[PDB]
Design an enzyme around this catalytic site. Structure first.
Site, PDB file in Angstrom:
ATOM      1  CG  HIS A  34      41.017  34.637  31.850  1.00 31.19           C
ATOM      2  ND1 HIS A  34      41.193  34.170  33.139  1.00 31.19           N
ATOM      3  CD2 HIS A  34      42.160  35.278  31.519  1.00 31.19           C
ATOM      4  CE1 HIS A  34      42.391  34.510  33.565  1.00 31.19           C
ATOM      5  NE2 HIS A  34      43.006  35.188  32.588  1.00 31.19           N
ATOM      6  N   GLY A  55      47.368  41.611  34.820  1.00 29.59           N
ATOM      7  CA  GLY A  55      48.330  41.308  33.748  1.00 29.59           C
ATOM      8  C   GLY A  55      49.164  40.080  34.071  1.00 29.59           C
ATOM      9  CB  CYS A  58      46.022  36.087  33.992  1.00 27.33           C
ATOM     10  SG  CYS A  58      45.029  36.662  35.390  1.00 27.33           S
TER      11      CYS A  58
HETATM   12  C1  LIG Z   1      43.893  37.850  34.595  1.00 20.44           C
HETATM   13  C2  LIG Z   1      44.530  39.088  34.002  1.00 20.44           C
HETATM   14  O1  LIG Z   1      45.746  39.234  34.028  1.00 20.44           O
HETATM   15  N1  LIG Z   1      43.699  40.025  33.427  1.00 20.44           N
HETATM   16  C3  LIG Z   1      42.402  39.651  32.939  1.00 20.44           C
HETATM   17  C4  LIG Z   1      42.243  39.277  31.610  1.00 20.44           C
HETATM   18  C5  LIG Z   1      40.993  38.923  31.132  1.00 20.44           C
HETATM   19  C6  LIG Z   1      39.931  38.962  31.990  1.00 20.44           C
HETATM   20  F1  LIG Z   1      38.707  38.608  31.516  1.00 20.44           F
HETATM   21  C7  LIG Z   1      40.045  39.330  33.302  1.00 20.44           C
HETATM   22  C8  LIG Z   1      41.297  39.680  33.786  1.00 20.44           C
HETATM   23  C9  LIG Z   1      44.145  41.408  33.250  1.00 20.44           C
HETATM   24  C10 LIG Z   1      42.974  42.379  33.103  1.00 20.44           C
HETATM   25  C11 LIG Z   1      43.137  43.323  32.180  1.00 20.44           C
HETATM   26  S1  LIG Z   1      44.365  42.884  31.018  1.00 20.44           S
HETATM   27  O2  LIG Z   1      45.340  43.934  30.895  1.00 20.44           O
HETATM   28  O3  LIG Z   1      43.760  42.402  29.806  1.00 20.44           O
HETATM   29  C12 LIG Z   1      45.010  41.534  31.984  1.00 20.44           C
END
Ligand SMILES: *CC(=O)N(c1ccc(F)cc1)[C@@H]1C=CS(=O)(=O)C1
Ligand SMILES: *CC(=O)N(c1ccc(F)cc1)[C@@H]1C=CS(=O)(=O)C1
Lengths: 304, 304
Positions: free
Chosen positions: A41, A143, A145
């Site tokens: 993702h 952030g 993930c």
């Molecule tokens: C899961 C996560 O940390 N983030 C994320 C990244 C991509 C997505 F499709 C959904 C959620 C988080 C959201 C914004 S970021 O700063 O890119 C990281």
């Protein structure tokens, strides 16, 4: 003496954490040898997350779209592939801090340490369990993930978890390091509800053994029970059924304390039926279920 | 979302842990620059510990009696001195993994991570608080002496604790890194009882703010109180008196949630007077007091 919710030392994993940026999405990756593992993702906008087609989204991405930074040094990406719900980014440099490691897919009731990271930078470490409903009860902000869960056997890190999802009920879903979700969860922003959060009965019993070992003995009673009788009480209180496998696994703690497993079950039965009556066990007012028998032996015997 | 008892990442401290052996006594030391810090009782037999004269015991010890091992490499000891209840062993080699560090003496109610070690080898990491009675509630077996407690501000490790003593009640006593005991404790195997273990009121309130932030809101009530009225209830329940300093420190959490500190005090008052009625807050059945306001802001905002 003393019994605490103890994480593994995190240094070996600190040395593997990098920042992965694809377009305007940043999260954490795991750098082992010349491969960086991160959630697929990373290629999504939050808009994409409602119904992403990852294979199609991936076609618009080149090696040079994957910005990989280890502290303040950029890694060169020389290849990328999707495996289930993770990306493997091949880089031109083996991580010099790569520890001995394995990828292991853990069972529910098994515990592991999480190194919470933001932008490839460690924020903190805590102990989790894979819940019977294949969720974890984490602490994960935006952030976080690509933060990973691990066990360490002496010198070898066994990676068992990468963080992907927060369910609307504030519990956590993720994958093993092959990119396969624990449970029925998917990397899609949709209606996903966790099932019953059942209590890990063998972990409660381990913890009751830990309490006896460390002086907390008030809950020891004059009763015994059978697996079948105990299990009727387990059902009623949404506890996992106790198996002979679990009894066998509690054998060493049984031996060390001289309390038969079924006597400790009878203790647990009374605690379920009567509650704590405002008393505590190892500084907890409820029955802790995120120490395995292995965790109790480890912490009670001082393994390094 | 999610709120967990989170330790600092331990890697920076893992790289400072060594084994110190004097005669037949082995424990842990902290290698920073060309100095190894360890408890002075490294020179004692357990027999000695009943009434040790450390200056006299020390006269029988040379540099070469202090065996210092960093993994499987021996350090050369070129000097030794006693400072309060610690030994400083000067070695001929600066620790190449020395992080930026400070020695800080913390106040009661302040939290820190402990890296539990045996024979200079890390076993695990957990979060503690310096209790109002200057004990900590640790997990420490034989060999764990010289394990240290620390906070990390970005790149700088602040060492605040070294482990020396288990009291017969299974709570823990130790020193700052200048070798001064927290509280009235001494490195002698004698009658030492902890005073009242009072609850760190400002830490409970911080944690109540953390709960609201993470969705747990059932304990929010229609009441307010005053510091003086709250403090009468605090007294009764062996809670630290709440000061205007504590109210000021809770200002940012107050601001972020829109719940006035005194309204949260009124919430806490009702919880003390009525108990939880079998409910939980952030997965706890009692009022947690080992998160500082600073810890809550850090974990709720994702600082690294
Ligand atoms: C899961 C996560 O940390 N983030 C994320 C990244 C991509 C997505 F499709 C959904 C959620 C988080 C959201 C914004 S970021 O700063 O890119 C990281
Ligand atoms: C505190 C500790 O770890 N041990 C110790 C050392 C010296 C003493 F005088 C008392 C206690 C522990 C006891 C045996 S050891 O293996 O030397 C370490």
């Amino acid at each position: 003496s003393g019994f605490r919710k103890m994480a593994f030392p995190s240094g070996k994993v600190e040395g593997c954490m990098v920042q992965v940026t694809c377009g305007t999405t940043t999260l954490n990756g795991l750098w082992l040898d010349d491969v960086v593992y991160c959630p697929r993702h990373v290629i999504c906008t939050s808009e994409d997350m409602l119904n992403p087609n990852y294979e199609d989204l991936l076609i618009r991405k080149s090696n040079h779209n994957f910005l990989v930074q280890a502290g303040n040094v950029q890694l060169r990406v020389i290849g990328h592939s999707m495996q289930n719900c993770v990306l493997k980014l091949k880089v031109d440099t083996a991580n010099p801090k790569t520890p001995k490691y394995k990828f292991v897919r853990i069972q529910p009731g098994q515990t592991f340490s999480v190194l919470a990271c933001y932008n490839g930078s460690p924020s903190g470490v805590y102990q989790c369990a894979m819940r019977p409903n294949f969720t974890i009860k984490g602490s994960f902000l935006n952030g976080s993930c690509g933060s990973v869960g691990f066990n360490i056997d002496y010198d070898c890190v066994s990676f068992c978890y990468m963080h992907h999802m927060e369910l609307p009920t504030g519990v956590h879903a993720g994958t093993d390091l092959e990119g396969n979700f624990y449970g029925p969860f998917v990397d899609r922003q949709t209606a996903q509800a966790a099932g019953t959060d059942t209590t890990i009965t063998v972990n409660v019993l381990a913890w009751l053994y830990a309490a006896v070992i460390n002086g907390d003995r008030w809950f020891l009673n004059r009763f015994t029970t059978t697996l079948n009788d105990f299990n009727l009480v387990a059902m009623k209180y949404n506890y996992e059924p106790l198996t002979q496998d679990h009894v066998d696994i509690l054998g060493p703690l049984s031996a060390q304390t001289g309390i038969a497993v079924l006597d400790m079950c009878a203790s647990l039965k009374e605690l379920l039926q009567n509650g704590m009556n405002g008393r505590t066990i190892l500084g907890s007012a409820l029955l802790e279920d995120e120490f395995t028998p292995f965790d109790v032996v480890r912490q009670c015997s001082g393994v390094t």
